[PDB]
Amino acid sequence: GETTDGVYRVMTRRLLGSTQVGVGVMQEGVFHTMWHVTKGAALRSGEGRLDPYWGDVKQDLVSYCGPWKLDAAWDGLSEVQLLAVPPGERAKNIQTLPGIFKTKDGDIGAVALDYPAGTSGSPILDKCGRVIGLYGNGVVIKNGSYVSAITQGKRE
């Protein structure tokens, strides 16, 4: 079906009406999203079928039609934009300065913006428009609010 580069909504008709379960990036013929959005299931793009190619539950990522193509990384200093695609609402850029998730295996960038869980898979951008990660996997703080990591895959 449609394989043009850009941000896409991931929808389902299993629930009442049409429901948005997540978002994804189409780049170089490859659809990239978070594992918890699709659970590795096949996707439909009009009459076409998108079969999974690579996935990992721990990284919480999955690619369709080919290997992971997104390799840009947060520089640790600059502000970034979350191209949030919320359910029933238009795609909208939100600029923020990321925080840090400190782990036993190193530090990761983290964005602190409040969006429904259906916004998961929405890309995080650098000043050049390059996808430095996806939004949708993080932690719940004392405030009940959500802080998501800047999740990036590996390009081979």
Partner: protein, 39 residues
């Protein structure tokens, strides 16, 4: 059966709404890909 719909181009927008804080949090990542707060 899940399906996809195009929602826009991937571009940085100058003068976008700037919001959100920059917290430094101690976290752990488990085998299920789930983050948790460490204190």
């Amino acid at each position: 059966d899940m399906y996809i719909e195009r929602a826009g181009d991937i571009t940085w927008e100058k003068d976008a709404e700037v919001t959100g804080n920059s917290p430094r949090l101690d976290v752990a990542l488990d085998e299920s890909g789930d983050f948790s707060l460490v204190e």
